[PDB]
Amino acid sequence: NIDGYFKIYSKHTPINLVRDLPQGFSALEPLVDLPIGINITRFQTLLALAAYYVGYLQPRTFLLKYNENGTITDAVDCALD
Amino acid sequence: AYTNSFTRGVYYPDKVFRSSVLHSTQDLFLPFFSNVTWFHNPVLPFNDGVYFAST
Amino acid sequence: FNGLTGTGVLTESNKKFLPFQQFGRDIDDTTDAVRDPQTLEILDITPCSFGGVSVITPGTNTSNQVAVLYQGVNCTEVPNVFQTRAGCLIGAEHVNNSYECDIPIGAGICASYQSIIAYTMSLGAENSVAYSNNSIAIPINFTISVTTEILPVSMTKTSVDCT
Amino acid sequence: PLSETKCTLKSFTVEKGIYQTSNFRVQPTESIVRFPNITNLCPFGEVFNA
Amino acid sequence: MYICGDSTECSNLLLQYGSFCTQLNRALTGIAVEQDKNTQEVFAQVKQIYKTPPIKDFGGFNFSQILPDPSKPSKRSFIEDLLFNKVTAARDLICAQKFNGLTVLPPLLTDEMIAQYTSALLAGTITSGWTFGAGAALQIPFAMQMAYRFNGIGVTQNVLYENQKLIANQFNSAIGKIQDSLSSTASALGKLQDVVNQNAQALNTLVKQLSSNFGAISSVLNDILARLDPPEAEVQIDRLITGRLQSLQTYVTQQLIRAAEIRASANLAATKMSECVLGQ
Amino acid sequence: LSSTASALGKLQDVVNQNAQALNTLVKQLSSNFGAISSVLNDILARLDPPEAEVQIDRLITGRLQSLQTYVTQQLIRAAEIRASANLAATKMSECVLGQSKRVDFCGKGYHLMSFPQSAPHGVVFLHVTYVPAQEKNFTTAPAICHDGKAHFPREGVFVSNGTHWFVTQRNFYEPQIITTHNTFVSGNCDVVIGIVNN
Ligand SMILES: *[C@@H]1O[C@H](CO)[C@@H](O[C@@H]2O[C@H](CO)[C@@H](O)[C@H](O)[C@H]2NC(C)=O)[C@H](O)[C@H]1NC(C)=O
Ligand SMILES: *[C@@H]1O[C@H](CO)[C@@H](O[C@@H]2O[C@H](CO)[C@@H](O)[C@H](O)[C@H]2NC(C)=O)[C@H](O)[C@H]1NC(C)=O
Ligand SMILES: *[C@@H]1O[C@H](CO)[C@@H](O[C@@H]2O[C@H](CO)[C@@H](O)[C@H](O)[C@H]2NC(C)=O)[C@H](O)[C@H]1NC(C)=O
Ligand SMILES: *[C@@H]1O[C@H](CO)[C@@H](O[C@@H]2O[C@H](CO)[C@@H](O)[C@H](O)[C@H]2NC(C)=O)[C@H](O)[C@H]1NC(C)=O
Ligand SMILES: *[C@@H]1O[C@H](CO)[C@@H](O[C@@H]2O[C@H](CO)[C@@H](O)[C@H](O)[C@H]2NC(C)=O)[C@H](O)[C@H]1NC(C)=O
Ligand SMILES: *[C@@H]1O[C@H](CO)[C@@H](O[C@@H]2O[C@H](CO)[C@@H](O)[C@H](O)[C@H]2NC(C)=O)[C@H](O)[C@H]1NC(C)=O
Ligand SMILES: *[C@@H]1O[C@H](CO)[C@@H](O[C@@H]2O[C@H](CO)[C@@H](O)[C@H](O)[C@H]2NC(C)=O)[C@H](O)[C@H]1NC(C)=O
Ligand SMILES: *[C@@H]1O[C@H](CO)[C@@H](O[C@@H]2O[C@H](CO)[C@@H](O)[C@H](O)[C@H]2NC(C)=O)[C@H](O)[C@H]1NC(C)=O
Ligand SMILES: *[C@@H]1O[C@H](CO)[C@@H](O[C@@H]2O[C@H](CO)[C@@H](O)[C@H](O)[C@H]2NC(C)=O)[C@H](O)[C@H]1NC(C)=O
Ligand SMILES: *[C@@H]1O[C@H](CO)[C@@H](O[C@@H]2O[C@H](CO)[C@@H](O)[C@H](O)[C@H]2NC(C)=O)[C@H](O)[C@H]1NC(C)=O
Ligand SMILES: *[C@@H]1O[C@H](CO)[C@@H](O)[C@H](O)[C@H]1NC(C)=O
Ligand SMILES: *[C@@H]1O[C@H](CO)[C@@H](O)[C@H](O)[C@H]1NC(C)=O
Ligand SMILES: *[C@@H]1O[C@H](CO)[C@@H](O)[C@H](O)[C@H]1NC(C)=O
Ligand SMILES: *[C@@H]1O[C@H](CO)[C@@H](O)[C@H](O)[C@H]1NC(C)=O
């Protein structure tokens, strides 16, 4: 949520490993941009008749690399080492 | 139950095409080699945007 | 297109834009390709032709006619048209000879008075020495020559105040 | 062109050589403006054609 | 063009800044002319254009590595091909121009005449020694030329005439070794790549300088002109108009400063060519 | 020199460059720079001290920028002239006061002397050079072996006019009869290429 604009990114890719998050890269493409204008602080997930990771977004600088077809192949974190 | 998110959480920042170029971007990203909290009803806070992965 | 402005020449394009991805951009952060928001077709943009203008003259004291050189542009669109690799001349006639030439033009082409002819400059007279492994050529008569050269050493001393 | 050379050099005699006079740009013949389709018109007959 | 393209009010505002558009063009023209003079000063030192004869009786020495090959793309002599391939066609069309008043002019002398000059110098050196720098070239056997050059450093001539085969073999082996030295190592050509990198980076910085607010509302002239009223928008324009002048002046000054040292190096190269090649 | 003009190009170019720089600097003094007028006295006599300072500030900053530009350009030009003066000093010390054995430094040929002459803002040299001509080519030989001993020439080169052999200096045709006094022996004539009996 950026200054009243809710943006949704996503990705659906099959994975070979079944242990944890595999090693590799997978970019995300925007789908929905909605300016409702609600400044949120708590959220939940609902169900009917398991396991979901959660991470927090922080300001940073990256160095993205684009291939010949405009798809990110890799990125470098700037203030790491 | 912290897990090291190796190289996950990178998205296209802007609605612009680019080919064979290296781009320096400043946006809300997930820092590399960070900790993700494994979960299993439990409500979670929403600071400024959440990266939600699931099986 | 979709608010962004500019001036250029539009051409059909065959790039590989991603379905959600609108328009391209060059290395120097300059627009290079666009997607038209009516039929979703890739399109290319070329900067419009522009360039300097030069005048080649043989001197007012000699004659009163000149040639006009348009640097750069492929001169199909310019209001004896001779096309070179640096713009194109107007007012000079091409020849198939090569002379050690007067004032240059560029890219090996140069022009001179005769009535303003443009050609390709020649390095010099061509000769081949008759080399062998059993003969030497020795001079018999010498000459003494005098050569002048000019070297500046200083200029005028000028002082400028502020107040 | 000779008169332009004389004016830009600010003299009545020009020696042998090449001089630059000005630059030229190909002016735009017309303008093109493009916008997406005009959908989802506001309902105005509810408060007018009622 | 660079300060503000295709705008009328911007041109009217710029016209009141005096003539801060003419000395820039004059300085750039002076640099461009001096660049052609630098190239003309070094190579153009031979009167005629000599060529090597089909005779290849050089006493054992093998110059085929450096003599031009007729069955070549541009009559270049093997080594020059490696030199050109190790540095990062040029005839396709005329489109070397950017969006915002950036033009690149072609050099007066193309590579063909440079190759012809070098070939003429080499052929004169081989078939005439140092006699082609003073007056007219006189033929002389190559072995005798080597003998006199040995005599020029104190070593008597009869060293050559009794050790010709060993010296020929050593020369051929050295020419063979320089081949591998040039082909394998890429860091050797480290003085011709710096100029290209510096010029490209300077031009890139100049282009990227355009998208800066400089204290105005936006970095695009059209939006400011078409969103503010004329009587008020004048103040915002004359911040960009002041920033672009500073950027362009900085670029011009840096170009002059870095061209001075190139001129010095070209003069040194001319001296080396005139003294080390045409003589001993 | 008396008839053909336009030979003193460099000095004229220097003078023209300096004069044109001064002219543009002086001409720059007549621009509004966004103020009301290009003369201080008019603004001074028309406006009031509290609100006449903005125009003066604009004029001051514009003129200061122009003056800085002129000074920098003059510094570059002075450095170039310094380099030229250093070269002229070297030539004066090395060619006038002696003889130059380095090729194509003073003239096109074999140098003999020079004479300096003054000029409005520089110096002019008059190099005297030696240049040969009227070529003629003979047949040569590396060394001549007699009585089983291979003789080489002390200083010169072997030539022949069809029948006989002579020793000549390199840069002039002076035939001399071959003698033990101007040839030195070294080894035997069995490993040299080009030995000629005589
Ligand atoms: C960029 O897109 C092109 C498609 O235009 C990709 O080229 C295809 O590559 C696959 C993989 O071998 C081939 O099976 C197709 O035949 C290719 N298409 C052609 C030749 O038209 C190219 O690989 C892509 N580059 C990437 C993803 O880096
Ligand atoms: C707006 O409406 C027009 C029709 O009025 C759409 O044009 C169609 O475009 C598709 C491909 O994009 C073609 O296959 C159809 O033939 C077009 N229709 C006609 C009648 O020619 C257009 O796609 C719509 N959307 C936009 C953004 O313009
Ligand atoms: C040096 O000797 C050579 C060969 O004997 C001369 O070269 C040729 O001279 C003939 C004279 O009839 C010309 O027809 C040829 O064209 C010459 N060869 C070439 C390649 O031009 C040469 O003239 C002699 N040198 C002098 C000064 O007479
Ligand atoms: C060497 O050159 C000089 C000058 O070129 C020759 O001297 C000339 O000889 C002719 C005939 O005797 C005279 O008419 C000229 O007046 C002389 N010139 C001068 C400057 O006095 C000289 O003969 C040549 N030597 C040889 C061997 O050819
Ligand atoms: C309300 O009804 C009127 C009467 O029909 C509409 O006006 C006409 O509508 C038709 C059909 O769209 C058009 O072809 C005519 O050009 C309209 N004429 C005028 C004078 O408007 C009107 O569009 C309807 N809706 C509203 C909001 O007024
Ligand atoms: C001069 O050197 C060249 C090397 O460039 C020699 O040419 C090579 O000779 C070897 C020996 O058989 C061949 O295997 C190569 O294929 C040749 N290469 C080329 C490009 O020709 C040449 O033989 C040498 N000549 C002399 C007289 O020494
Ligand atoms: C100047 O432009 C013309 C055409 O615009 C060039 O001539 C060729 O024209 C055909 C037909 O349009 C094109 O397919 C070719 O690509 C053009 N040639 C090239 C090299 O692009 C002409 O060559 C251009 N002038 C120069 C010096 O390149
Ligand atoms: C080569 O030079 C020699 C030496 O000058 C010539 O032989 C002399 O010729 C003259 C008359 O031409 C005789 O008087 C002498 O007796 C000869 N011998 C000597 C030792 O001087 C010879 O004729 C010349 N050959 C040619 C072809 O010019
Ligand atoms: C100058 O070159 C010629 C031709 O290359 C040499 O003559 C050759 O000498 C060798 C050595 O005995 C013979 O095997 C060849 O048959 C000769 N060639 C011909 C065409 O007869 C001559 O020896 C060389 N002279 C010098 C001093 O190097
Ligand atoms: C030069 O003279 C030498 C010695 O007089 C010659 O060498 C021998 O001469 C004799 C007598 O004519 C021959 O029978 C031999 O065959 C020669 N060679 C040897 C190895 O003894 C030589 O032939 C003469 N000519 C040259 C060109 O050297
Ligand atoms: C976001 O929170 C601030 C206070 O932290 C609040 O003033 C603002 O209104 C919120 N944003 C929205 C869109 O309500
Ligand atoms: C992740 O957690 C481990 C264990 O508590 C800790 O050592 C590490 O520093 C943490 N890293 C981050 C980025 O929080
Ligand atoms: C014009 O040129 C001719 C030949 O170059 C010359 O004789 C004449 O003096 C020149 N006239 C002027 C006024 O320069
Ligand atoms: C030069 O020669 C070619 C063919 O030899 C010919 O086509 C061309 O017209 C000639 N150029 C001129 C200016 O006559």
Side-chain angles (χ1 to χ4, degrees):
Chain A
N1 284 317
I2 300 299
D3 53 54
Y5 293 73
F6 174 21
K7 312 181 182 65
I8 291 174
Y9 304 167
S10 66
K11 178 52 100 183
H12 273 87
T13 174
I15 63 175
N16 297 4
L17 305 185
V18 289
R19 193 261 178 193
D20 58 343
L21 312 174
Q23 286 75 246
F25 182 76
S26 190
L28 315 177
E29 46 272 5
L31 315 182
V32 169
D33 194 327
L34 183 62
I36 298 296
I38 309 188
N39 189 358
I40 311 169
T41 195
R42 305 291 340 280
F43 82 95
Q44 313 86 55
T45 315
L46 61 83
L47 294 174
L49 74 164
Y52 66 97
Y53 296 168
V54 167
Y56 291 164
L57 277 299
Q58 287 159 11
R60 206 143 298 271
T61 295
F62 277 170
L63 190 86
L64 309 164
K65 161 164 174 291
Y66 290 80
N67 59 358
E68 70 179 2
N69 298 346
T71 66
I72 303 185
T73 54
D74 47 352
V76 161
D77 191 359
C78 200
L80 178 66
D81 48 348
Chain B
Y2 300 158
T3 298
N4 215 32
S5 46
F6 290 160
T7 308
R8 305 206 52 80
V10 180
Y11 53 82
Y12 297 112
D14 51 359
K15 184 63 65 68
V16 163
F17 172 92
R18 256 180 290 258
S19 166
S20 66
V21 298
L22 286 87
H23 202 42
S24 169
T25 55
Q26 294 97 299
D27 200 72
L28 277 296
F29 283 88
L30 182 66
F32 275 18
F33 296 88
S34 163
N35 285 349
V36 295
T37 71
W38 180 107
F39 265 83
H40 203 249
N41 310 68
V43 192
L44 277 296
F46 175 89
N47 296 317
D48 57 356
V50 296
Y51 166 85
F52 171 84
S54 175
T55 297
Chain C
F1 281 108
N2 290 318
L4 63 90
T5 187
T7 64
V9 177
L10 273 60
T11 302
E12 213 280 341
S13 177
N14 60 321
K15 261 169 180 178
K16 299 288 95 176
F17 277 34
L18 270 290
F20 72 99
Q21 191 181 41
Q22 275 294 78
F23 64 93
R25 179 165 267 95
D26 206 342
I27 303 168
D28 50 356
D29 299 333
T30 45
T31 317
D32 202 0
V34 190
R35 166 199 296 269
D36 55 336
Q38 286 294 107
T39 196
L40 277 72
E41 174 202 310
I42 317 301
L43 200 68
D44 197 336
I45 286 181
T46 315
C48 284
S49 283
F50 82 90
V53 171
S54 300
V55 175
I56 297 90
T57 177
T60 299
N61 170 49
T62 294
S63 187
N64 296 115
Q65 60 167 307
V66 298
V68 167
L69 197 148
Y70 296 93
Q71 303 188 4
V73 65
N74 187 294
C75 63
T76 287
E77 60 288 18
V78 175
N80 294 120
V81 179
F82 182 46
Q83 165 81 71
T84 68
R85 286 293 176 185
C88 70
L89 270 169
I90 288 171
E93 48 269 61
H94 186 216
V95 294
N96 275 3
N97 291 312
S98 305
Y99 292 165
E100 183 48 90
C101 73
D102 272 326
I103 62 170
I105 284 169
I109 298 290
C110 55
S112 66
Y113 199 44
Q114 191 267 331
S115 309
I116 307 285
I117 51 167
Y119 45 79
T120 308
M121 65 180 288
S122 189
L123 314 170
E126 184 269 334
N127 77 314
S128 179
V129 62
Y131 170 72
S132 185
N133 65 309
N134 206 7
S135 77
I136 70 169
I138 292 172
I140 309 191
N141 212 5
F142 62 96
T143 62
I144 310 305
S145 84
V146 170
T147 309
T148 76
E149 46 168 324
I150 297 92
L151 285 163
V153 306
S154 68
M155 63 196 199
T156 73
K157 312 158 67 179
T158 298
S159 185
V160 180
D161 211 338
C162 294
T163 297
Chain D
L2 193 58
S3 291
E4 288 177 353
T5 302
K6 286 176 177 185
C7 290
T8 191
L9 182 62
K10 201 148 301 194
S11 296
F12 274 24
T13 46
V14 293
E15 295 86 3
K16 178 204 275 297
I18 190 167
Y19 311 89
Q20 176 164 356
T21 289
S22 66
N23 51 358
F24 99 120
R25 300 153 272 270
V26 179
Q27 318 288 349
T29 66
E30 70 264 13
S31 68
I32 296 305
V33 59
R34 306 297 294 282
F35 278 136
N37 294 0
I38 309 299
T39 57
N40 64 11
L41 207 59
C42 295
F44 287 108
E46 183 67 29
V47 307
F48 289 134
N49 286 351
Chain E
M1 185 64 73
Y2 171 67
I3 296 165
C4 49
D6 54 64
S7 166
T8 63
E9 43 268 23
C10 185
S11 292
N12 291 318
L13 262 51
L14 181 50
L15 183 63
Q16 87 192 359
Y17 269 59
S19 58
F20 265 117
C21 290
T22 303
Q23 56 275 70
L24 309 178
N25 295 340
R26 197 182 307 125
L28 293 179
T29 300
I31 285 173
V33 159
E34 191 62 9
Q35 284 322 297
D36 297 310
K37 177 55 69 179
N38 270 355
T39 316
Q40 198 94 38
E41 175 185 27
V42 176
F43 290 107
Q45 278 165 346
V46 54
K47 302 320 170 214
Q48 293 82 17
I49 301 292
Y50 315 86
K51 67 167 70 67
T52 177
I55 277 178
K56 295 308 192 290
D57 288 331
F58 287 146
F61 307 79
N62 192 7
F63 286 113
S64 73
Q65 204 80 72
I66 51 176
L67 286 184
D69 188 7
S71 70
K72 274 283 196 300
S74 294
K75 301 326 163 203
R76 287 194 293 235
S77 64
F78 192 75
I79 303 298
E80 308 194 35
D81 279 5
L82 291 191
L83 262 61
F84 267 75
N85 286 354
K86 280 315 168 187
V87 172
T88 72
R91 179 230 59 82
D92 51 356
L93 74 164
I94 319 183
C95 77
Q97 64 184 359
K98 325 207 113 227
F99 289 64
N100 290 316
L102 292 181
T103 315
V104 166
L105 317 181
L108 165 63
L109 281 192
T110 187
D111 305 64
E112 174 51 41
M113 299 157 247
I114 309 293
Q116 280 187 65
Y117 281 154
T118 61
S119 159
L121 277 168
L122 182 60
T125 299
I126 291 156
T127 51
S128 54
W130 60 88
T131 57
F132 84 106
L138 324 174
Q139 65 268 22
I140 188 173
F142 193 94
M144 305 188 73
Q145 167 184 340
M146 268 314 180
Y148 279 81
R149 289 182 183 270
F150 280 171
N151 202 359
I153 64 188
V155 179
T156 44
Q157 54 185 253
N158 66 335
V159 174
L160 201 53
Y161 295 156
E162 311 172 333
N163 305 315
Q164 213 167 331
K165 308 288 305 307
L166 274 76
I167 297 174
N169 294 353
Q170 278 175 7
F171 182 32
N172 296 352
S173 305
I175 296 296
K177 209 171 316 284
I178 194 169
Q179 184 73 218
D180 299 335
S181 162
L182 277 189
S183 64
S184 69
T185 286
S187 65
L189 297 197
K191 290 178 71 176
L192 307 179
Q193 194 86 27
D194 66 16
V195 291
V196 186
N197 282 349
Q198 294 178 300
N199 285 118
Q201 193 190 105
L203 214 63
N204 200 340
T205 53
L206 178 53
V207 169
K208 195 152 307 287
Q209 199 87 341
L210 269 189
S211 75
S212 296
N213 293 1
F214 276 109
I217 304 169
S218 291
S219 176
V220 292
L221 277 296
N222 296 21
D223 195 8
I224 278 154
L225 286 176
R227 192 266 301 279
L228 271 298
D229 44 350
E232 205 275 335
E234 183 281 300
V235 59
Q236 312 291 62
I237 300 284
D238 204 321
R239 295 190 91 141
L240 309 195
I241 303 315
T242 48
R244 313 268 174 88
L245 266 295
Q246 295 298 109
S247 314
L248 191 59
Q249 259 297 337
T250 301
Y251 171 69
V252 168
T253 300
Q254 293 254 350
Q255 271 311 123
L256 283 158
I257 285 170
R258 70 178 65 253
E261 71 185 40
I262 285 286
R263 171 153 50 71
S265 186
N267 271 337
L268 170 60
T271 300
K272 266 211 201 203
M273 168 85 74
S274 191
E275 164 168 4
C276 203
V277 180
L278 271 73
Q280 194 192 9
Chain F
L1 202 58
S2 179
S3 287
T4 304
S6 72
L8 283 72
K10 330 184 87 177
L11 322 174
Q12 214 63 65
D13 291 332
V14 176
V15 174
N16 285 349
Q17 280 215 279
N18 297 354
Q20 184 177 2
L22 279 171
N23 169 43
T24 180
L25 168 64
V26 174
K27 145 131 354 237
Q28 201 73 40
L29 216 52
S30 182
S31 303
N32 307 142
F33 280 116
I36 300 301
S37 305
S38 42
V39 288
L40 283 72
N41 291 297
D42 183 350
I43 300 169
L44 277 188
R46 171 186 321 185
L47 275 177
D48 44 4
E51 311 325 329
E53 55 92 14
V54 187
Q55 336 294 313
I56 293 170
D57 187 77
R58 299 206 223 211
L59 295 181
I60 296 321
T61 191
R63 295 173 175 189
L64 196 57
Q65 186 62 40
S66 75
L67 187 55
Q68 284 184 358
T69 294
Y70 163 67
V71 164
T72 293
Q73 307 276 298
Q74 202 74 359
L75 272 172
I76 301 298
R77 213 164 292 122
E80 190 277 331
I81 285 294
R82 169 72 220 198
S84 195
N86 265 348
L87 167 60
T90 298
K91 275 171 70 72
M92 165 76 68
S93 63
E94 190 276 331
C95 283
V96 187
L97 303 189
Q99 198 183 29
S100 176
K101 294 181 176 67
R102 56 187 292 168
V103 165
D104 269 24
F105 186 52
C106 282
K108 270 64 147 165
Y110 302 113
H111 175 262
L112 292 176
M113 52 205 98
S114 291
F115 312 109
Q117 303 282 261
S118 193
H121 270 318
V123 72
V124 165
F125 289 94
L126 263 70
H127 308 290
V128 182
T129 58
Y130 170 106
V131 170
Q134 291 200 8
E135 303 166 355
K136 182 172 158 52
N137 48 6
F138 316 90
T139 61
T140 193
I144 291 175
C145 82
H146 154 79
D147 205 5
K149 312 182 303 300
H151 307 81
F152 304 72
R154 271 200 206 285
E155 294 294 328
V157 64
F158 283 101
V159 295
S160 75
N161 72 311
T163 64
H164 299 80
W165 287 90
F166 301 122
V167 293
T168 55
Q169 57 189 357
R170 285 207 316 241
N171 288 302
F172 213 72
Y173 180 57
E174 181 67 18
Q176 304 147 46
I177 282 158
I178 322 173
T179 304
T180 313
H181 273 56
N182 53 350
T183 54
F184 69 92
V185 56
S186 164
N188 318 299
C189 66
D190 60 357
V191 293
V192 179
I193 307 167
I195 300 288
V196 286
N197 285 355
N198 201 292

